[PDB]
Design a protein around this ligand. Sequence first.
Ligand SMILES: Nc1cc(-c2ccc3ccn(Cc4ccccc4)c3c2)n[nH]1
Ligand SMILES: Nc1cc(-c2ccc3ccn(Cc4ccccc4)c3c2)n[nH]1
Lengths: 212, 199
Amino acid sequence: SMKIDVVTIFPEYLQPVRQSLPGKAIDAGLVDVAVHDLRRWTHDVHKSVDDSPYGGGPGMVMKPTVWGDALDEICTSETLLVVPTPAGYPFTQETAWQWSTEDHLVIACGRYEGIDQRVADDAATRMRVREVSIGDYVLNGGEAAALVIIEAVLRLVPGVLSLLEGPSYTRPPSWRGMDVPPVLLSGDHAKIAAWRAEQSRQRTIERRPDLL
Amino acid sequence: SMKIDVVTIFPEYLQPVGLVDVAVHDLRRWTSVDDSPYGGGPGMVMKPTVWGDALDEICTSETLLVVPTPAGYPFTQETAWQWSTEDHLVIACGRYEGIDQRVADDAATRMRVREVSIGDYVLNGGEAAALVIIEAVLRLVPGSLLEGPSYTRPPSWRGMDVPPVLLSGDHAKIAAWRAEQSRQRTIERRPDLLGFDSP
Ligand SMILES: Nc1cc(-c2ccc3ccn(Cc4ccccc4)c3c2)n[nH]1
Ligand SMILES: Nc1cc(-c2ccc3ccn(Cc4ccccc4)c3c2)n[nH]1
């Protein structure tokens, strides 16, 4: 049973998430994903969510007063507050496993140059906060990261949704001049397992030497 | 100018997307897309036949074929820069337990192919990875260390003050403080970026 609240100035970005959820899991109360427009918590007629960076520099910074009100409303002391950021700790499968048993995730999606640091710092005085990066590339905001996190976590929640894996094959046995490796059709399952293990080792050496 | 084609059995997932055109194609237009794995194992594999026909129609020899997969080479910022000057990206999104390896092998006889991972976690398919790749690449289209903390008004909030140096207007002191913050953050969160052991 997990509640996920996502806060964003682009609520439509998260439409695929609510789409990918099977009715049975929602009906069984296993998962609830809610998306909130950050501008609900703006103070002014111009619905401002950003402002110039102290110390100067390019880009804009999201306002702490707006974010503070939104998180005040949405979070509780039991919330795990997830803040995507290119400067975050790495989000890995181990993280996804850990978060998969949480009762309440709140994902705060930044835009522009990010969120005033006091927002996370204030939140961390009364709840668990996790600033996380999903990889070593730069996005325009947290929304695509939220999609990735939500998918990786929820597929580990029952019934809701190391070396590298080697190549996989299915029918037909021959296609465009390329045969499925004969060992796979051999019925020697010890040999198949060893062949797969060796494929995995080779692929890891070639693609991800860092894992070795 | 860049053209991106995305191929998927879930075209609706790609909807979160003049110098660039992006098109989404339903793989099923070229047909059941999956079958049991040769050699055994859980799950299903996407059949090469349907993929071959789709890519035949969509790709040229100039195409960079991008295939998200947990077993891929890492997609990094360097990759994003490299791909930002390409004329034509085609992103083949798999589902189930992935795509028959022969699809990428066949394609590689005609075009450049890149199997890539966007990070060390497992998705249910290639669609979310396509969204990530598209965003990271397109923000670089013509037309290190971790980022430190940023602040904006008010200078005091809930009794939390903006670091006084940022209000001082001294560029050199500000540049120095931000460098220190970034180095401190990199050591703590990403020690690997500075050549140290991971936690
Ligand atoms: N792994 C990962 C995470 C992000 C991410 C997350 C949230 C935000 C909010 C704004 N931006 C844009 C930005 C560009 C440069 C410097 C700071 C912020 C974000 C990027 N990118 N890559
Ligand atoms: N970095 C990254 C990439 C992917 C990814 C990409 C395409 C597919 C197609 C099916 N799956 C699910 C799958 C689970 C296990 C083994 C193989 C495939 C995919 C995952 N996840 N994480």
